[model samples]
Structures are given as structure tokens and as C-alpha cells.
Target: SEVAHRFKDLGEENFKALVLIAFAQYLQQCPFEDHVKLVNEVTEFAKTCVADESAENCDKSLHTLFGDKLCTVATLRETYGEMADCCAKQEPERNECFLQHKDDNPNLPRLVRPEVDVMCTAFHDNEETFLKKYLYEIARRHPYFYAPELLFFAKRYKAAFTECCQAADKAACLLPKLDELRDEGKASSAKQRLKCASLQKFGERAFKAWAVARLSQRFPKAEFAEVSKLVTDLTKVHTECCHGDLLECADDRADLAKYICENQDSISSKLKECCEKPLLEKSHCIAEVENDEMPADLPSLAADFVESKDVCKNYAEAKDVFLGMFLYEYARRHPDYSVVLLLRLAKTYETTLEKCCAAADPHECYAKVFDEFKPLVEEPQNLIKQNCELFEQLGEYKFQNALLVRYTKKVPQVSTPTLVEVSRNLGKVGSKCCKHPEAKRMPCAEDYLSVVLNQLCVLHEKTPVSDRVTKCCTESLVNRRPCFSALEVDETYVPKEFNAETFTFHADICTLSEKERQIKKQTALVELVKHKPKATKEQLKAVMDDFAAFVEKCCKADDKETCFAEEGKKLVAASQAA
Candidate 1:
């Protein structure tokens, strides 16, 4: 606040790059057919608005684009009231003026709500008119979206309105459909970001090579000649900087993006916009794009590949290249399996090789490795789905505490402080990211969950380990999350002792913030589940209610400390009774 320089100096080409929200709205005012006619004029105006040009240049451009004098000033007033004025006044410093004030009137008009009194009348009188405005709502904000993508989006939107507008309860039927569209949009963006992640992670050549490998594997029946042609055309798609060169990337992909729309009745989702974006972003947009349904029949890798002792030597010599080849082989047979999943398998196989290489008989050691991955072969994407389902079911806070309870049973020797700290972070990831639509939810869930798993893996490495911890924690970082996911809670194995402080309340706990108190409450619940691993949800809730009941009363008591100690004894006795 004290010292801030304006970001008003962003280059002419880039300055108004993000100012396309209201930009698309004005363009929509002209007839759709004229948009093709106006393309040159509009793009000229786009160039005309650059740094050296006066604000008057842009005004003159818009005036011509909208027709000589047909309500230009009024439309400007309606569309970008303050921004229009600011740009006109600050000619000498026009770029900064536009940049500084563009955000002042950035938001598009809100969609008319279901409860709006005239909603039906608005829908009924001019259905196409209402839907065009709905397209304006979508297309304006997503400035890069092409005409066809917006049309597809509008098609979906109109279908929802058609289905829901005649319903007995408009809000009940239509609102969900609308929200689903919103979720689809969120998922769309999530996938685009993932392409960038892979781009950055693998770098250009490797990522492009992998994409070619994947594309070949994905479309098995396509002749290698046809496949070769596509992957080359799509090299820019794999290699383009995800955060940069979007429009250039789109130019290469646009021809293909259209066919997906053409094949709408066949098999596709909301991917026209994805194809409209740049190379890596588009691939990721499409890649980040969907629930790549796990294979119903995951036929095993050839026993030759899995059983070969020669693999150990190849892996030792070529390391990741051999692993990459294996990933290609493993994934090719399981068509359209996600790259992330393949990477998971690669990590698994890598770990298998690491151990098998040291064996008395390497081939014998390697022969049994396939059996170790039997469950994985049978249920390809289950752990990820399992984690996401629980995240969806329990929510962040509940899952965070759930992990605590589970980990306590899994690794009881790890101190409560360590488990609490780790589990709290896991839940925090859940709390922040789990609420995202499925596309958006997965990366964050896996990224952070693996992070916590990594922390646990290293937590005991330099120190002495328990039999269970030593076994699974020794697994590589990549597989440890899966490894730990496979680990079981040992409720039958008794703790040497139980702590009384776990389920009891104290005066100090009463002073905690609402969130702090909730953490304490869950901590108590986790401990209760830990000591009496066989406890049911109903019992846990009953105990928490009784504990909370005393906490409320005890906090207000004149002898708060004495009251907590006396009442807490009963809670502890109930625990001992178990």
C-alpha cells in the first residue's frame, strides 16, 4: 500500500490481451454472418488499439465497425462506461489509462436467475434472442473461444433450458443442468493446466515423443503412415509453450477441433474450445479433459516382458528409457489409459527392478513381480478413484481426520504430533481443492496426497523403522502413496497403552477458535478410534456429543479447570470400559 508502481507499462500487444471480456460482447452485437465480413475490420481494430495509436483511432475503428453513427456512444456507455471515458481522456498515456481502468467495468452482465419474475416470459417470447444473450454471457468471458465452440456451448445451454424451462419446478430441474455446464467448464480448464504440467515436467522433445507414442497406442487401427502424419502435424501441439503461443498453437489445431464437433453424435465431450486453444494447452485441455474410463478388460502384459531377466540389465543400462518403453508397451495394450497412470506403473516397475536386481536368482525374483502387480492389472485406476470418492464423500476436514485415524492404526508407533501435523495438511489439500469438479479435483488431490505420503516415507528413513513402516516406506516416492493406500489398519493389534487425554476436555480447549476447536474435536475422535479401533461411527458421535455437551457447560463454570477435570474423568472411564 505504501509503495506501489502501476503495471501500466505492459506492451501494446499484450496490454489489452486480457481486456477481451467486454471485447467479445460488442462484436456479438453485429449479425453472426457479418462477423466473417468484419473479421478484417475487427482484427484491424485490434491492431489499432495498440500503444502508439491514439484513443481516437480505436473510437474511429469501433464507429465504423458498428456502422457510421448508430448508437455508438450509447453502446459504449452501456458496455464499458468508465473505461471508454478513461481511454479518451488520457491520450498521451493511453496504454496505461486503458490498462489502469480496464478492470473497472470488467464483469459481464449476470445470467437472468430462475427466480427472476419474468424468466419464463424472457425465455418464451424470443427463445433464440434469449439464448444468443446466453452465448454472449459465455463467449465474452472466454475471449479465446471460437464461434463454433460458443455455438456448441449455446447448443448445450439451449437444450438445458428447453428441458428445464417447461418443468413443474424450473429452479429444481434447470439449475442442476446449468451447474453441470459450469462444472464441465471448470473441468475443461483443469485439463489444460495439466498439459502444461507435463510439458514443463518432460520438456519439449520428450513430451512430443511421448505424445506420439501415446497417439500411436491410442489409435491402434490407424495405419502407422496416417499416425506418422498426425503426430508430426501435432508436434506443435505437444511442444508449444503451454503458457505462451496459444493463438499460434490454435492455428495448427483448429482444423481438427472442428471435426470433433462434427462427430458430436459419435463420441466426444465439451472439447471444441480445447482444440481452439494452443498445442500443449489444447492437448492437456483435451487430455486434462475427461474421465479416461479404465479398461474393462486389462489383459496382462506378455509374460515375456514381465518375466525377462534381460529387463533388469536393460533397466540398469538405460533406466527411464527402458521404463518408458515398458510404459509404452504396458499402456498400448490398455488403450487410452492416462499418461499419469502409465507413470504410476513405470514407478511401480522401476521399484520392482530395483529389488529384483539384487536377488540370488534375478529371473526368479523378477518372475514373481507380475503377481505383485496382479491387483493393479485387475483394477487399473481404482486407488485414484477410491481417493477421489472418499474426498467427495467425507470432505476435507472429515477426510483429514479420517487419514489421521487410519494412519494411527497403520503406524501407531509414529507419534500423535507427527500424524496430526501430516494429516492436517492432507485435509487442507482436500478442503481447498477437493470441491473442484472431477477434472480439476484429481491433480490437486493426487499431488498433495502424494506429498504427504512422501513426507511419511522420509519421516522414518534416517531413524529406526517398524516392520510395517520399514516395508512400505522403502517403496519409491511415486508408488508410496499407492503402497500406503494398500496398507491395512491393524485394529486387532493392541497399543501398549491408551492416552486418557484423548477424549477428555480441558478449560484451555474452550478458548480455541471455532476451527481450532474443530481440529481438537477431530483429534479426539481420531484418538478414540485409534485406542478402540473397533468403535462404530454412532458410538464416536455419541461420545463427541457428550464431550461437547460438557465443554459448553464447563467453559462457563466459575471453577472451569475443576469442572473440566471432574467431567473429563467420566469420558475417560467410558473409554476404559471399551
Candidate 2:
């Protein structure tokens, strides 16, 4: 608990680094502007937080910082005993702290608790708390173990303790059962690794959307609307997502809705956010929001746009409301806009409306606003095109490392561990999603990048604050990465720098499967790149060659941790002069 308490007086930068590293990609995508808006008001918000003083304050901070990204005191402990442990560890220690896990190993298979007689007292002390701690501990230790199986293990773990405490010989009954529970550690993390790969590639909502679409194709005769409904039922157990495609149901009613109208809500959460506005605005916003989940099977656009020459009567009568609806509709539809760009569009439309509502050429002036806003998107469209093209050129490896190299400099406050981890994740996501067909590929980029960019925006909330990230974060949700990417590094940044990182190799690393070996190599390069941003082919290969030799002997001899640790430091030492 003192570890938790140790963090109370931890510098804001400490808290800042912990969360930023935990949400490693946050630095890669989220920018400065979004964080400042909240940062300016957060001190008072935390002071307003009450309860267990330091402990509760941590919750307030966690929830307030990026609740979705990093929440819960126990998680804080998990991260610290870990981040929320690495919190006090300095750079080399921190780098080593992160580098040791087979979690990065992505395949190392799945720790907890004290006491024999005291175990029963502890279990009964707070059954729910102990069980949750047990579950999280298991998850922390073996991040890739079957999640459903973990649930099963927890139930048994709990049942074993409950039965043991009431037994004639508590230690005898519980001790053997503990052995059984430990035996359950024999499971695979490859499923989680794949899920991480999927999430990185398709994101949570994007994959679910594809899952729904892919399901529909299996039943051509099935109603499209009903297919989505069927998906909703299944996902209710697992989906933080939901339903739509009511056009067919709505179509059968004469007094009612059409496909476009009913289908508007059948989209992204950002799209859902837009739909929550006024009825007229809802239709317009729904029409506007980018659907990264754009199903390939959806019907073509609903008829051509036609507007009645309602005289100037409507504009004159409801100038503000009409124009406000105009932009809300326009803004929602093009969720790819920056707030500045949206503001400009609004200014242009509102100004154009006032001038044209009275002018003889009112029609032309109104038309200019629409056409002018059209080309604004052209600049960003070129950017989206370039990102996908480069993704193809570099694919995942080169594209991903280049991003990490640039990101470390761009937001130097982020640690090498954070840089390497996020880069690895972003790469995994991009590998699967970035190379799709134009219809599928472009939306894939939008959904994937939007998720990354939004997270990065908050990393600056506690920094001196990078105006680049701040401004970029405030921009429209679509392809915000381009704006941040184009900006130079934050001159005001503070890097929690580390010397070169090294991992002590136990012989098991030799035979734990090639995927595991490859990950070690991959992570080694990542550390090299993060530490030496301009590290050349010359330096990298020399170190890697030594590693290859080390693995061969180490793998062959089935030998020493220290020898590898010595060689690791030597390899790292060798790179220092580079």
C-alpha cells in the first residue's frame, strides 16, 4: 500500500509518464490542444475529489486523466508494482523493468497470495476484493492466458478456498488444491496475442463491424436489418457495440421512415454522438460522419440532393437556427475536419448566408460556401491517400519503426519502453488493416488512425504542453495523425531518458518457440531505434550478429543467465559509442 502511497507526492510528470507509457500509443496519435482544454481545469477537479485522500486522489487522477485508458487503483498497483512499481525506478531500471516480460514475448505462458491458515482469514477478510485482486494478479502475470478460462480458474480458486476454510484440515485440503490451481497455468497466450494483433489492426468497433458484415454474407437470403439485429443479441454478452439497419423495417410503413433516415444511426460512436443532436441536425450529421465501419453491402446514396428555392423566407425568418443547422449537419457529415477548419466553414456559411439572403445573386454566394468547403477536404484527402500509399511502400515494419523514431523525438517525454511498445502495437494493427481495397482500406485507415490520434492527444495534458499535439488533437477525428506528423518535435519536451536496454537471456529463450525468439529480436531492434534514433545499419547488425552468436551457444549449451546478461550489457556497451 505504501507503493500506492509513495505515488501521492509523485511529481505530476511522474504521473504523466506512467499514464503516457501505459497508453503508449497515446503519444503517437493524441496531440496538444485536446489536453490543454482539460488540463487547465483538472487541478480543481482533483481537489474536488474526496474519500481516502491519497488513494481516492489517485482514482480522481486516473479517471480524470483518461479514464478509458488507465483506471482503477488496483490497476495502478498492477502497473506500479509494475508502472505504478516502475514509478520510482529510474531510467535504466525502468527500461529493464519493461523489457523482462514475455508479455512483450507475446507467447510466454502465465502468480499470487500468502498464507496457509492466514489464507482463509485473508479470503474471508473481503471475498470480493481478494478474488478480484487474484484475478487481476493472474491477468497481470499472464496477459495472454484465455480470459474465459481465467474466469473458470477464479471460480475454482474461490471455491477451493471456501471449501478449505471449513475443512477438518485446512492446510492439507487447500495446499493440494493450490497445486491444482497452479497447474492451471498450463495455457496459451497466443489467443490474446492474436486479439492484440487484431485490435491493433482493426480496433474493437471496426472488427465487430466487419464481423457483422462477414456474418451477413453467409446468409444472402437473410434480411440485412435482421442480420445486424442478430449480431446485437450475440454481442450483448461481449459487445460494448450495438444495432441498426432498420431501413427494411421502416420501409414497410407508409406513414414513416426511409432507408437513409433510418440507416443514419447505423454507424460509429462519433456518428452516434452526432445523431444525438436535433432531429434535422441528426439526419444531416448522420449523413456526414465518417463510417470507418462502412459496410461494403450498404445501398447506394439515397437519391440526389435537391433543395427548394424557399425564397429567402426561411433564412430571413430563422437565420441563426437555419445556419447553425447547416454547419452542424455539415460538420457531423465530415467528421474529418479540424475545429479551426469547421469554425472557418461556419464563419463562411454564416457570413455567406447574411450577404446572400439579401443580394440579387444570393444563390451564387450560397453555392460558393459549399464549393469552397469542398476543396478544403481535398488537402486532407491527399494526406489520407499518401498514408495508405506509404503503408504499402513500407508495409508494417519500416512504416512502424519510422513512426516510433519520429514519435520519440516528437514527444521526447515518452520513455523508450513506451516508444518501443506503442510502435510494436501500432505496427501490429497496421499490418492487417492498412492494405485493404480502396473501399475497405481507406475506412480502415480512418478507424485505426482515429483511435491512435485521439489517445495521443491527452499525453500533453500534463506536459508543458506541445501546441502541435494540442492543435492536432483538437482537429476533426479523421486522419488527425497527418497534422501531428507534419509538426516538428515539441521543443519544450522532457525525455525520461534511459541508457541502452539489455535483457538477460536464460536458455529457455533459446527454445520457447521461434515466434518468441523473433519477438526478442524485434524488441531488440526497437530498443536500438528508440535509444539511437539515427542508429545506422552498421551499428544494428553488429549488435544483432553478437546476439545471433549468443543465442546459438546459449540455445545449444542450455546455459547461463549471467553470461547473456554480460553479453547483453556488452552488446549494449558496444552500441553506446555508436
Candidate 3:
């Protein structure tokens, strides 16, 4: 009683106010049945305090209720200890102080008393705040696991929480769910589980956004209803396979593979039907619907080789018609050398010539290369024998290294058994080529080279070539082995221009005699312009002047062919100019 009386040290009015405030706070956590009873008891206590109008009587009555344990003052006082003390002052000072302290310690541990459902319902009422107050805590504790999930939710539900307090409201809703999780963890003494459900929800929404974006990009003409179904089908497979956590989906999971196989025919058929039509008169229909999920069947060896010509064009340039003629000439001169052996040796020699002629003197370069490889030239069969061993080692090494490097960055979905078989098949071809006993009379060297090239061509389908891979192949030609030359099989190979014909060179200038060509080009342009009936003499003069200036500045100074190519086109086109 004495302890409760201390709470009524202020006036009777203040005592009544304090009692109501504390009781209302207590009623917050009480069950519905007890709420009315507590309010009625507090009302009766207030009536008695007002009727008596005595501080001592009010104090005694408070002590009587609290001391008898009919009402408890200590609970509220202990919970908001300093706030209760402040409430003992005058009303204005008390209210102002409470507000000031509320702001000062916003993150003060809130009252723990909770009705589980009441907390859960707060989320539905104001989810944004509910999340801010609690989900942020989970994110902070396990930032790596929860932060991304929260960020994704925020993006997905951007409009839902456009205002400041909405996030806080959402956070408020999450608190109760979080509390239940915490209790379960404490009960089992288990480490906190990652918020997988939230992460899963975020991933679902993000994928929806990505799929919609792709639909707009790839099938803009596609109707919303059509693309919506496509998105649903695609996302459904991912959702089922990953079980909400997309990160758990393995690249080569059998179930995922099975799902694609089972569903792709229907999905692709739908895609084709939907995207085939043009949206309007001016728009052209798309030929095929593209899906990254759909696996491409391997192309044939010849088809693959056709593509590689563009890829290895620079490396194949030296093995052109001029080089082929040299192979035939060598076969004619050396009666013992079969055409097959001589052809292989000729390719090896062309690789050497290309390097030697890099600075531009084909005759000198050929002579130097001839002298260096004279023994191989004299015994062309010997060159083919050496190449058989070198190509086997170098080709396999280049292919394997390129594949391994590419896979380090990209996860490959293809089977390892198939890739190993591809390598094994190429190895067998190499062994067959080298094992031929008739080194001098081997009439099968050309045929074996064709087989080896075809195998490499097929390998090229899955194995991408990088600039560095090409560089390695190019450098291998210069090495004592010359495997680079042995691999060149493009019938379309034509040498790139160098020296006088190359873009970097090709301009002979302004020795008055050489100026004749520039003069001839200008005169032709003038005659073409003269035929225009509307052409003014001054305009004609300007055209000629411009042509002369171009010749002087361009053709006579540098890049004669490049300048002439552009200027000649312009001259023909502008001949109608007046």
C-alpha cells in the first residue's frame, strides 16, 4: 500500500490521469474478457479519487488496489520506468517530456507482451511498417542472406510502399511471423534458417519482370494473353524445379532436363503460332521463335567447316591457289613423292612463307623459306611424317585448352561422355595417319588430312574460338612443327593484300609522271559533269577544282586506291549535279 501511495504524490487530478494511462497500457496485452473488467475497475478507482479530492485518500486507494494485487503499478513503471516518473509531473511537462524521450530513443526495446494473432493481423492492416520495424532486423543480422530478398520485395512492391511509413507498416506485419520463427529456433536450439520463402518470392517476381521484358523484346507483336501463357509455362517449370529457391536449381539437373524435353514441343509450337503473325500491314512476320532453353542439335561436319572458314580466315590465307600450284610442281619434280605427300609438305612450306613474307616481299620470302626447308622439300614424304605427329599433339592441345578456358566462365550443360568421345575420335584419326608404313609412297596422306580437318570442324561446333586461340594456332605454324599449315583446308582461301596493295601502303605520289593517273581520273569526272544540260560553268569549275584538290590531298599524298574508290563513286553519282 505504501509503495503504491508513492505513485499518487501529485494532485488527485494527476493521480487519476496516471492510473488511467497505466491501466490502458496494461489492457493492451490483456485478453478481451479481462479488458472490460480492468477498465471498469480503473473507472471505479478514478470516481473514488475525484469524489474524495484528497491526495492521501487517492494514494491510499492506489495502494489498496496495487498492494492487494487487484491492480499492478510496478509492471507499467518497470516497463516505461523513466516515462512513468515523468508522468508524475504537471500534465504539459509530462506530455512534452514523454514525446521528447519517445523521439530520443525510437529503437528502445518495445513492450514484449503480445497476442500472437493480434501481431499477425497488424501485417494485414499496415504491412509496410510491420516489415520496416522487424524484417530490417533480420536483414541486418543475416545481410548476405536476407538483404537481397528484401531489396527484391521492395522493387516488386514499389507502388505498395510508395509512402515513407508504408515500409514501416509492412515491417510491422513481418514482426509477428519473425517472432514465431524465433520461438521455433529457440525451442529447437537451431541456428537461424535463411529466409528462404522471402528469397523465393523475390525470385519469382524478378523472373516475371525478366520474362515480360524478353517478351517485349523478342515478340513485340505477341498479344498479352499469348505471352502471358508463355511466361507462365516457362516460370512454372523453374518454380517447380527450384522449389522457390532458384539458386538451388542445378544447371544439369535431370528433372529440369526432363521437364524441358517434356514441355518444349508444346511450348515451342505455341511460340511459333503466336509470334508468326505480323501485328500490322507494314510489319514483317518473324521466321522463328527463339528460346535459350531449347537445345540446338549439332550441325554436320561440312556445315561446321563452312563456318570455321570465316573464323580461321587469316590462318588459311597462305594455302591459296598460288600455294596449291607449288605443291603440284614439287610432286612433278620429285618422282618418288606422291601427290598426297607433296600437298601436305607444300602446306607446311606455305606457313613458313607467310611468316617470312609478313613484311612484304613474296619472292624473297619464298626463296628464304625454300632454303630453310630444302631437306623437307627434297624429301616431301619426310615432311608429311613429321606433320602427322605435330598436328595430333597441337590440334588436340588447342581444342582442349580452348574448351577448358571457355567452361571456366560458363557452366556447360552438355554431356561429358559425348565430349570425351569427340576427342577420342580425333585421336584415332591421328594414330591412323602416323601408322601408315609407306612413308615415301603413302598415297593416303591427302585423304587422312581431309578426315582430320572434318573431325576438327565438328569439334568447333561446341568449342568456341577466341582471338588468343587463333593466335596460338598462328604461332604454332612458325614453331619447328608447322601444324597450323597442315590444318588449313578451306578451298576458298585467298591471300590478304600486303605492301603496295594493302590499305596501309598503296600510294605513289606527285613525281610529275605518277600525277598522270590522278589527272586522268579528274578529266573523266569533268566530262561526266559537262553532259548535264543544267550545269553552270562555275558549278562545273567547282566540281573540277574539288576533284583536283582531292587528288592532290588524297591520291598524290597517301592511300591512292582508297581515295580513288570513294572519289570515283562520288564522281559518277554527282555527274548530274548542276
RMSD of each: 14.3, 16.6, 35.6
Extract clashing residue pairs from model 1: 191-288
How much is the lDDT of residue 393 in candidate 1? 88
TM-score of 1: 0.42
lDDT of 2 at 560: 47
RMSD of 3: 35.6
**What's the lDDT for residue 249 in model 1?**
42
TM-scores of the models, in the order given = 0.42, 0.43, 0.19
User: How do the residues 171-236 of candidate 3 rate in per-residue lDDT, one tens digit apiece?
Assistant: 565454445555432212111021122124245643443344444334333344555565555565
C-alpha lDDT of residue 242 in model 1: 44
User: Which regions in candidate 2 have their CA more than 4 angstroms from the true location?
Assistant: 1-366, 370-376, 379-385, 389-398, 459-467, 474-479, 489-531, 535-557, 565-570, 573-578
How far residue 92's Cα lies from its native spot in candidate 3, in Å, is 92
lDDT digits (tens) for residues 1-578 of candidate 2: 22233234433433332232233211112223333333334433433443245554444324223432222231356333444443345444433343232243222223333678788988889886566546545554443343333444666788898899999999889999888777435312332343233333335543344334333323223344544554444333222100111111111211111333454344233444654554333433432344343233533211111133653566677754454444334433432444334545555666666677786766655654567667655554565566667777876766675666567666655444445655655555556565555434434554445444543543333343455565665554333655765667555543332653354556567656674575676566655554555554556657667778877765555444566675656665566674
- The candidate maximizing lDDT is 1
lDDT of each: 0.53, 0.47, 0.37
Better model by lDDT: candidate 1 vs candidate 2: 1
Q: Which stretches of candidate 3 lie over 4 Å from their true place?
A: 1-325, 333-369, 375-418, 430-435, 440-450, 462-578
**Per-residue lDDT for 116 in model 2?**
81
Residue-level lDDT tens digits of model 1 in 1-578? 00000012322222122122223433433333333334334444555455334544453423233332222332365664654554354333432343233121233454435562266668889886676556545644443233223344556777877777788887888777777878666444333333443454345544554554555445443344444455566666434324223333433455444444454333333455766664334443554444333335644665545666577778778775576556655654544343445556566677878987896977776676656665654353455566667877877766776777777777776655557766776666656664566544544556456555544544454354457766765544335556766678764576544674555576778766776787677667666765677665666667767777788878878783898777778677775566
